[PDB]
Amino acid sequence: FLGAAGSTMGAASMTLTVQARNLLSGEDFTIDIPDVTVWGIKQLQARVLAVERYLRDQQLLGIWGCSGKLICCTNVPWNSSWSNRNLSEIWDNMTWLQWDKEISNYTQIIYGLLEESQNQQEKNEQDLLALD
Amino acid sequence: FLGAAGSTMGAASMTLTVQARNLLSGEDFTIDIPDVTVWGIKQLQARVLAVERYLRDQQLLGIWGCSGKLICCTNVPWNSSWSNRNLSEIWDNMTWLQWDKEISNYTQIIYGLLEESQNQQEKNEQDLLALD
Amino acid sequence: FLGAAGSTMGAASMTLTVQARNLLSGEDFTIDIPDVTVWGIKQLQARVLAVERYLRDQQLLGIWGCSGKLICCTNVPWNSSWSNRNLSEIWDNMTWLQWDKEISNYTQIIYGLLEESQNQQEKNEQDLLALD
Amino acid sequence: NLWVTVYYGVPVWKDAETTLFCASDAKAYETEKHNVWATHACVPTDPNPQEIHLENVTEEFNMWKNNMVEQMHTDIISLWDQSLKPCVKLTPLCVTLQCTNVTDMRGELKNCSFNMTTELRDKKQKVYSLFYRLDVVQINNKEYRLINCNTSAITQACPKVSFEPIPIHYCAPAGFAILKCKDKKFNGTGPCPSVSTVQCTHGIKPVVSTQLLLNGSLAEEEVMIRSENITNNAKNILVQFNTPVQINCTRPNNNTRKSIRIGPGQAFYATGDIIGDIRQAHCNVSKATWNETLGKVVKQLRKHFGNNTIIRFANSSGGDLEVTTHSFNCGGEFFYCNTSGLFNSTWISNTSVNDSITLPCRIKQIINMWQRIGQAMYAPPIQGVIRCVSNITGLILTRDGGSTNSTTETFRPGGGDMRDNWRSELYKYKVVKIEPLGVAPTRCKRR
Amino acid sequence: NLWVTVYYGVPVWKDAETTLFCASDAKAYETEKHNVWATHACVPTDPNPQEIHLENVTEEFNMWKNNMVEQMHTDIISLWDQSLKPCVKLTPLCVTLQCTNVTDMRGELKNCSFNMTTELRDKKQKVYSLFYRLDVVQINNKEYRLINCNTSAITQACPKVSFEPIPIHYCAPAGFAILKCKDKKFNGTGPCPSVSTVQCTHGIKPVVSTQLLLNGSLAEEEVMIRSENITNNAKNILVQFNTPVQINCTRPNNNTRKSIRIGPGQAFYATGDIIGDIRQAHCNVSKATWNETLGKVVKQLRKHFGNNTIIRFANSSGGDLEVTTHSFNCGGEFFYCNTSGLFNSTWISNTSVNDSITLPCRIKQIINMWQRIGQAMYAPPIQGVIRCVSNITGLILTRDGGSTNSTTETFRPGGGDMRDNWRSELYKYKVVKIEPLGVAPTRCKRR
Ligand SMILES: *[C@@H]1O[C@H](CO)[C@@H](O[C@@H]2O[C@H](CO)[C@@H](O[C@@H]3O[C@H](CO[C@H]4O[C@H](CO[C@H]5O[C@H](CO)[C@@H](O)[C@H](O)[C@@H]5O)[C@@H](O)[C@H](O[C@H]5O[C@H](CO)[C@@H](O)[C@H](O)[C@@H]5O)[C@@H]4O)[C@@H](O)[C@H](O[C@H]4O[C@H](CO)[C@@H](O)[C@H](O)[C@@H]4O[C@H]4O[C@H](CO)[C@@H](O)[C@H](O)[C@@H]4O)[C@@H]3O)[C@H](O)[C@H]2NC(C)=O)[C@H](O)[C@H]1NC(C)=O
Ligand SMILES: *[C@@H]1O[C@H](CO)[C@@H](O[C@@H]2O[C@H](CO)[C@@H](O[C@@H]3O[C@H](CO[C@H]4O[C@H](CO[C@H]5O[C@H](CO)[C@@H](O)[C@H](O)[C@@H]5O)[C@@H](O)[C@H](O[C@H]5O[C@H](CO)[C@@H](O)[C@H](O)[C@@H]5O)[C@@H]4O)[C@@H](O)[C@H](O[C@H]4O[C@H](CO)[C@@H](O)[C@H](O)[C@@H]4O[C@H]4O[C@H](CO)[C@@H](O)[C@H](O)[C@@H]4O)[C@@H]3O)[C@H](O)[C@H]2NC(C)=O)[C@H](O)[C@H]1NC(C)=O
Ligand SMILES: *[C@@H]1O[C@H](CO)[C@@H](O[C@@H]2O[C@H](CO)[C@@H](O[C@@H]3O[C@H](CO[C@H]4O[C@H](CO)[C@@H](O)[C@H](O)[C@@H]4O)[C@@H](O)[C@H](O[C@H]4O[C@H](CO)[C@@H](O)[C@H](O)[C@@H]4O[C@H]4O[C@H](CO)[C@@H](O)[C@H](O)[C@@H]4O[C@H]4O[C@H](CO)[C@@H](O)[C@H](O)[C@@H]4O)[C@@H]3O)[C@H](O)[C@H]2NC(C)=O)[C@H](O)[C@H]1NC(C)=O
Numbered sequence A, B, C: 001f002l003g004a005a006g007s008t009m010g011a012a013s014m015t016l017t018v019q020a021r022n023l024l025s026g027e028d029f030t031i032d033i034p035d036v037t038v039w040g041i042k043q044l045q046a047r048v049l050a051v052e053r054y055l056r057d058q059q060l061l062g063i064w065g066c067s068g069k070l071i072c073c074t075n076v077p078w079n080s081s082w083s084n085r086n087l088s089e090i091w092d093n094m095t096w097l098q099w100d101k102e103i104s105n106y107t108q109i110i111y112g113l114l115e116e117s118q119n120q121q122e123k124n125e126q127d128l129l130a131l132d
Numbered sequence D, E: 001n002l003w004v005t006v007y008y009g010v011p012v013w014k015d016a017e018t019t020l021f022c023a024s025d026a027k028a029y030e031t032e033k034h035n036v037w038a039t040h041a042c043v044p045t046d047p048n049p050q051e052i053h054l055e056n057v058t059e060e061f062n063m064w065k066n067n068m069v070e071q072m073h074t075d076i077i078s079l080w081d082q083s084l085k086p087c088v089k090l091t092p093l094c095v096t097l098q099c100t101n102v103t104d105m106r107g108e109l110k111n112c113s114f115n116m117t118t119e120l121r122d123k124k125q126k127v128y129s130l131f132y133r134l135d136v137v138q139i140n141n142k143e144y145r146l147i148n149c150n151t152s153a154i155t156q157a158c159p160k161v162s163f164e165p166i167p168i169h170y171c172a173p174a175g176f177a178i179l180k181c182k183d184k185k186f187n188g189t190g191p192c193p194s195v196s197t198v199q200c201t202h203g204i205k206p207v208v209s210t211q212l213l214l215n216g217s218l219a220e221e222e223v224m225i226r227s228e229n230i231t232n233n234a235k236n237i238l239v240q241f242n243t244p245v246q247i248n249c250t251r252p253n254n255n256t257r258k259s260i261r262i263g264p265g266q267a268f269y270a271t272g273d274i275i276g277d278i279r280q281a282h283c284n285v286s287k288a289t290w291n292e293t294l295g296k297v298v299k300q301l302r303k304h305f306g307n308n309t310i311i312r313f314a315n316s317s318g319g320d321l322e323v324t325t326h327s328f329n330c331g332g333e334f335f336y337c338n339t340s341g342l343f344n345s346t347w348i349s350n351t352s353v354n355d356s357i358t359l360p361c362r363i364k365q366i367i368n369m370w371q372r373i374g375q376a377m378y379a380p381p382i383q384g385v386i387r388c389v390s391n392i393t394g395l396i397l398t399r400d401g402g403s404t405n406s407t408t409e410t411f412r413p414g415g416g417d418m419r420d421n422w423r424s425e426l427y428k429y430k431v432v433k434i435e436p437l438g439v440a441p442t443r444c445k446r447r
């Protein structure tokens, strides 16, 4: 649970599943048996926005070239203008917190390449290749 | 956003992603910070039925031969009795609003071919073909 | 709807889709039009925990080697120590209720092989095989 | 060789507890009358309820361990308070009551004069009303007071709403299921050969009554005998009838509503003078129909207490009025009937040694049911004579502890707990949660 | 060469604010006594809370900017009103009070006779009660009135519920996380070398007190000194103790409950006569233990104010009773203690120039805490003598503005804001939201 946040990106890929589990899920099944008008909304407001924030992430995962959780790849080429770096300088020498810091400017740009350039243009491409 | 509703089905396939985005998502994250007994249920009743209506659509997408959003194909043959037409008479000469109008009788029939004839009989077929 | 619960596992695979449908879905769209402080939470508490229990099942389906509903397969080898049996003694001669009864000890063990041994180690394996 | 495979939607369920909602049949809403009983926003019932018969299945049921009863019991209670919340509170009715004997049957009705607050807070109001003897208690001419004032507070039920029971289907949310026992003869315990599943339970009218199950469901073939612990005399014995028993309960007093103004904005409905028959409320039971039923029931008790034995019936032993009498609601009024006349008999092995029968009934407007303290409900007067016809579908019975066990046994009408009333309709139902996820070994593996 | 790839569940979080819920440890529910404090439906704590130590991580914390405090502060306030809503309102207690001096210590207790409304709305009731001098105020024999009547309304707390603080774990919903600072010495500001994460915070007893942190968490090694802005004398100084200080607060008056009937249905609990020791409430502090603590604390202040300087202590300057005295709840009663005896001292560089000490305490049943207007709570009388033993885990201190800064400094007990009390337990916690979505370049591409 977040243990590799201080570690390098290369080491952070091993514990990736643990973060996926706990973040994704509520399974406490505790409370809500006897009603209250007051406090109960408060324990509602938190978990309702939680599932709204949850489906928000799942949409990006679906509309992109993933359609599945954890890791998935894409046909989007990595631009030189986006963090021009060494491969060993990223995973081995650099950390995720340090990484997301620089990409902050190109983050919104990259998102467009996933939904527009791919799953809009890829699925249509697939339809044309599946006809023959 | 719905801009091609008046346009032909052929042109309506380009902006398909836009409709998918906005319809799918709530990301306002506005309100619900300070509690009210009265009005608050009203702003609840709307978004709660919204996510219920949402998962309803996602189920059909899953139980059918799609398992993914936007466009996906299937092994169900198009019946002649279902809108006997010309291919250029559908996408190029006809519109979606005009299209769903005629299929209204066969809509419930087609739905059956997707869940029963395919993913019930296809996945079982897949299990028999993956053994060897 | 549960009709094959008394029948053998082999026969229970045919009606599998029916159980998937009804269990998965709420589509009543009945009530919630006019507000009540009292009873309304009660008709809320039931369906809210329902969708929480729902996403709980969907997570296992995603984090495992399935990524889709109904049936899906995996690379996890069946251990001899886990219900050493005859193939015709399971599907043809035995029932699901009778089946889950014995696996009760190894159920938590098998779950680990799906999320850890596969989708953690398989997807990473896939990344290494997709590079070349 | 094989490999593990995830199956979704396998027929596997476990016994559990959840929160069940109601169903009104979407007609009760057209019945209107400003939220009759439960139905206000109540869920429209599916026009075509689904019942799926599960072949080759045997499930063990316990009606006394059933959790659907406890929810329903708490539902009616919670339903009751919410009806009384928006209504008019009667708090300043505790004023001294000067009463006198009405113009026969030992003056059951009291004509009471008292001081009252008007719309204005300046001058009081000298007005008279009519209360039953059960609603008032003297304190030391004759001076009386409200019977509930020393015990608790009081509020008046709104004349708009009605207490009329309407069919209510209990259904389960997504992820759950309700099992139904289709056998003709079921005592509520043991395995069930034929079991079916339904999304919604059958039509159940929440009729609150004592010593008599009213407007319930009939049994099949032979009449049924149900008890939690039978040999134990501390446990009540629930009976289910085959043929319905015609019962008449009326209010042989043709009344009028005063509708006095205790403003601002609030108006109380006082009981005016009685114009008509001078009589006490009465309950009719046909001598032929009750006897025929009794003869069939008394034979069923001998499937336990032995083929030959003496079974004697007697009226209530003693206790609260709710226990000792038959308590219910007809036309908005609450009747308390004397069942002593029906339970006076002595039976032989197969037999027991006129065209009609009657039962004196008492009326009480101020009631505390379910042993509730802090809230007392005042039943508003009803214009004209109330007449109602209901089915008697079962009883609540208790066995004496005095034994002499090998000699003879005596049974008396029970009461108290209202859960038994709901167990009468819920004996064939129980709640389970469905487990869709499953694993099975197969050759398919993966690429 | 490479290609973009979506990673889900990357270790990335951002500082944010969310709505946190409680946890009762699932034992407090068995403690029952009709909803003690918070716990009614309160969430059962996970029997095995998880604490994950994050290696190679350094996070900067600010306890004064912490949002968990503001929620907790509003929680206790919102919790307070909901406890008082179903209870009995004391509104017609504003009747004139004819009081007289009790049979020593300048007549602290007043014996008051007054007129009261009975169950009936006709005749009044002549009855007497016993109120503390702080609860009443005369208006111009001796005639008094409720002290809160001119300021606000008043309601009585239910005898069923108790104000007894029970451990409450604050947890975060899905998508969020709580960071924990594991260092032994932390002042609440700056980077934290060792940081761990938990789903639920540790056991925190919501003990509301002034000038003394009661039943809190002990520090590690050296005692801790915390202040928002230190050189600023306008900001309070929070102190955390190492060893707990034994404190005794009792009610040396053995009392009885009148339980008068002001119906219908409502019953007020009046304070009857006192049978026992004739005394004023008192607070005991062991001279040896307080001194030892003081000597260790006074050395810590010299890590800031310089190695050599004169530090003098004195009692409260002035203000509201809540500020000038030690305010808390023991056994349901609310004590206000005179701390002037403890704070009378003068210290040298390392030193200061009997077996027990005592502190006179005053009792007030009618209270407005948190500067609340419109709602006043009446603390119900308690049968018998109340005795309680608590830990003193810290103080709220203020520095004088008069300077003469380079000469000497004087410190006095603070008060007012109750958020500081919660900042004492929450200094090591803060709320962040987790960002799972991430992108990284890799060769895999796609087919
Ligand atoms: C539902 O309702 C039903 C009824 O409505 C309830 O049934 C009741 O169940 C309880 C059980 O909790 C029964 O009490 C138990 O009775 C047994 C048996 O007692 C009978 O037989 C004894 C022996 O009989 C044989 O031997 C003689 C001599 O050879 C032969 O002639 C006989 O033919 C037999 O072969 C006999 O000794 C008993 O007589 C004594 O007791 C009766 C009843 O009180 C008296 O009238 C008599 O005068 C005489 O004193 C009787 O005939 C007892 O063995 C049980 O005793 C255990 O429990 C006691 C606490 O109640 C405890 O003090 C004892 O020490 C004893 O505990 C011993 O045994 C335990 C188990 O092995 C050990 O763990 C323990 O350490 C210790 O060693 C008990 O008294 C009721 O009789 C029965 N009701 C009726 C009407 O019969 C049912 O409980 C309800 N259930 C639910 C879920 O609601
Ligand atoms: C937390 O609490 C702490 C304390 O508890 C708070 O600290 C307080 O912070 C404020 C800042 O907001 C300080 O006030 C500021 O002080 C500076 C510095 O003043 C000192 O030094 C001056 C120069 O000293 C050098 O020069 C002499 C001469 O050679 C040498 O001998 C010296 O050794 C030094 O080398 C000196 O002139 C000052 O003396 C004057 O002021 C004091 C204090 O009022 C008087 O006693 C003296 O008699 C004398 O009048 C002093 O010794 C000032 O420079 C600041 O002035 C700015 O702000 C004023 C508003 O308050 C404004 O009117 C001025 O014009 C000035 O603004 C100028 O500078 C800005 C920045 O460059 C420009 O943007 C602006 O346009 C304009 O040009 C200010 O007075 C407090 O002193 C300090 N508290 C203490 C006890 O020292 C802290 O704020 C709190 N924080 C939080 C978050 O809670
Ligand atoms: C067990 O089950 C049985 C059977 O299901 C239950 O018995 C039920 O009892 C209900 C009453 O509690 C009863 O409801 C009645 O329905 C009658 C029939 O309605 C239908 O016909 C009318 C036309 O007549 C249609 O318009 C209507 O849409 C229906 O189709 C109504 O006639 C009844 O109204 C009268 O009775 C109730 C009390 O029973 C009064 O409150 C009501 O005001 C009515 O009384 C006035 O009218 C009659 C003449 O109709 C006069 O004789 C009487 O004095 C009243 O007149 C004065 O008062 C009115 C205003 O109140 C005023 O306008 C007038 O001018 C006078 O001043 C009532 O609606 C069910 O029908 C009945 N079931 C069946 C199958 O019949 C039994 O309760 C159950 N047990 C328990 C414990 O619940």
Ligand SMILES: *[C@@H]1O[C@H](CO)[C@@H](O[C@@H]2O[C@H](CO)[C@@H](O[C@@H]3O[C@H](CO[C@H]4O[C@H](CO)[C@@H](O)[C@H](O)[C@@H]4O)[C@@H](O)[C@H](O[C@H]4O[C@H](CO)[C@@H](O)[C@H](O)[C@@H]4O[C@H]4O[C@H](CO)[C@@H](O)[C@H](O)[C@@H]4O[C@H]4O[C@H](CO)[C@@H](O)[C@H](O)[C@@H]4O)[C@@H]3O)[C@H](O)[C@H]2NC(C)=O)[C@H](O)[C@H]1NC(C)=O
Pocket: E164, E165, E207, E208, E214, E215, E328, E329, E330, E331, E332, E382, E383, E384, E385, E386, E387, E388, E389, E390, E391
């Ligand atoms: C800081 O932390 C400290 C420590 O955690 C806090 O101190 C806590 O204070 C609590 C009271 O506020 C106290 O709770 C008490 O627990 C006692 C022990 O309970 C256990 O033992 C009993 C057997 O004796 C078991 O049955 C039980 O299950 C437990 O295992 C109880 O004895 C206490 O009850 C008595 O005290 C309270 C007030 O303190 C009264 O309200 C209560 O009614 C009891 O008083 C009656 O009984 C005593 C004798 O026991 C008589 O002397 C007395 O006069 C009373 O008798 C009359 O009144 C009763 C009805 O009230 C009537 O029946 C009788 O006939 C007489 O008329 C109480 O439940 C915690 O235990 C204690 N913590 C520890 C560790 O001990 C401190 O409060 C915290 N600070 C703050 C600010 O919260």
Ligand SMILES: *[C@@H]1O[C@H](CO)[C@@H](O[C@@H]2O[C@H](CO)[C@@H](O[C@@H]3O[C@H](CO)[C@@H](O)[C@H](O[C@H]4O[C@H](CO)[C@@H](O)[C@H](O)[C@@H]4O[C@H]4O[C@H](CO)[C@@H](O)[C@H](O)[C@@H]4O)[C@@H]3O)[C@H](O)[C@H]2NC(C)=O)[C@H](O)[C@H]1NC(C)=O
Pocket: D246, D247, D248, D284, D285, D286, D356, D357, D389
């Ligand atoms: C509780 O109350 C209910 C309701 O009142 C009772 O149930 C009713 O019981 C009565 C009598 O037991 C019954 O009335 C008869 O119904 C017959 C149809 O089922 C009618 O045909 C019959 O009418 C004839 O008799 C009346 C009285 O003698 C005459 O006034 C009437 O005009 C009829 O006479 C005609 O027919 C004859 C031939 O038969 C012909 O020669 C004449 O010219 C004329 O044409 C009765 O009215 C009701 O039907 C019952 N109602 C129901 C719903 O079942 C119940 O008994 C009460 N219970 C108790 C314990 O008191």
Ligand SMILES: *[C@@H]1O[C@H](CO)[C@@H](O[C@@H]2O[C@H](CO)[C@@H](O[C@@H]3O[C@H](CO)[C@@H](O)[C@H](O[C@H]4O[C@H](CO)[C@@H](O)[C@H](O)[C@@H]4O[C@H]4O[C@H](CO)[C@@H](O)[C@H](O)[C@@H]4O)[C@@H]3O)[C@H](O)[C@H]2NC(C)=O)[C@H](O)[C@H]1NC(C)=O
Pocket: E246, E247, E248, E284, E285, E286, E356, E357, E389
């Ligand atoms: C606040 O209140 C608390 C609670 O009252 C105080 O804390 C208590 O403090 C007292 C005294 O400081 C302490 O009492 C002693 O505890 C010892 C155990 O820790 C006992 O052994 C001892 O009992 C002996 O002395 C009593 C009085 O002299 C005798 O009555 C008793 O019988 C004992 O004598 C026996 O032992 C001797 C040998 O030593 C033998 O020769 C005799 O035959 C006989 O067998 C004391 O009672 C409590 O333990 C403390 N309680 C706690 C929980 O710590 C606190 O001091 C108060 N604070 C303030 C500021 O007032």
Ligand SMILES: *[C@@H]1O[C@H](CO)[C@@H](O[C@@H]2O[C@H](CO)[C@@H](O[C@@H]3O[C@H](CO)[C@@H](O)[C@H](O)[C@@H]3O)[C@H](O)[C@H]2NC(C)=O)[C@H](O)[C@H]1NC(C)=O
Pocket: E287, E288, E291, E292, E295, E354
């Ligand atoms: C205030 O704190 C000081 C410590 O800074 C306390 O001084 C302590 O005084 C006691 C005597 O009252 C000392 O106990 C003595 O111990 C020695 C050695 O065992 C023994 O020879 C003596 O007979 C006596 O028992 C104690 O040691 C001493 N503290 C230290 C650290 O030396 C003082 O007691 C405190 N204030 C009060 C209320 O006394």
Ligand SMILES: *[C@@H]1O[C@H](CO)[C@@H](O[C@@H]2O[C@H](CO)[C@@H](O)[C@H](O)[C@H]2NC(C)=O)[C@H](O)[C@H]1NC(C)=O
Pocket: D111, D112, D113, D128, D272, D273
């Ligand atoms: C109940 O008592 C009241 C008086 O308290 C009766 O009302 C009086 O009726 C007589 C008729 O004989 C009138 O002359 C009076 O003017 C009435 N007085 C009031 C104050 O109304 C009432 O009639 C008695 N009960 C009934 C209606 O029979």
Ligand SMILES: *[C@@H]1O[C@H](CO)[C@@H](O[C@@H]2O[C@H](CO)[C@@H](O)[C@H](O)[C@H]2NC(C)=O)[C@H](O)[C@H]1NC(C)=O
Pocket: D338, D339, D340, D341
């Ligand atoms: C209920 O019915 C019984 C049986 O008729 C009544 O018992 C009568 O009680 C009175 C005294 O109140 C005796 O004088 C009669 O002799 C009894 N009747 C018989 C047949 O024994 C009883 O009073 C009725 N009601 C109540 C409330 O008890």
Ligand SMILES: *[C@@H]1O[C@H](CO)[C@@H](O[C@@H]2O[C@H](CO)[C@@H](O)[C@H](O)[C@H]2NC(C)=O)[C@H](O)[C@H]1NC(C)=O
Pocket: E111, E112, E113, E128, E272, E273
């Ligand atoms: C407080 O004052 C009341 C009187 O207002 C005292 O009650 C009286 O006590 C004497 C005993 O000396 C009795 O003779 C009287 O009958 C009592 N009068 C009432 C109205 O109760 C009361 O004793 C005083 N406080 C106490 C209890 O010491």
Ligand SMILES: *[C@@H]1O[C@H](CO)[C@@H](O[C@@H]2O[C@H](CO)[C@@H](O)[C@H](O)[C@H]2NC(C)=O)[C@H](O)[C@H]1NC(C)=O
Pocket: E338, E339, E340, E341
């Ligand atoms: C709190 O304690 C102080 C210190 O003992 C009290 O101060 C006394 O005040 C009275 C006047 O009310 C003087 O006559 C005494 O000389 C003071 N004592 C000392 C030692 O100077 C104070 O009264 C106590 N309580 C309150 C409420 O102030």
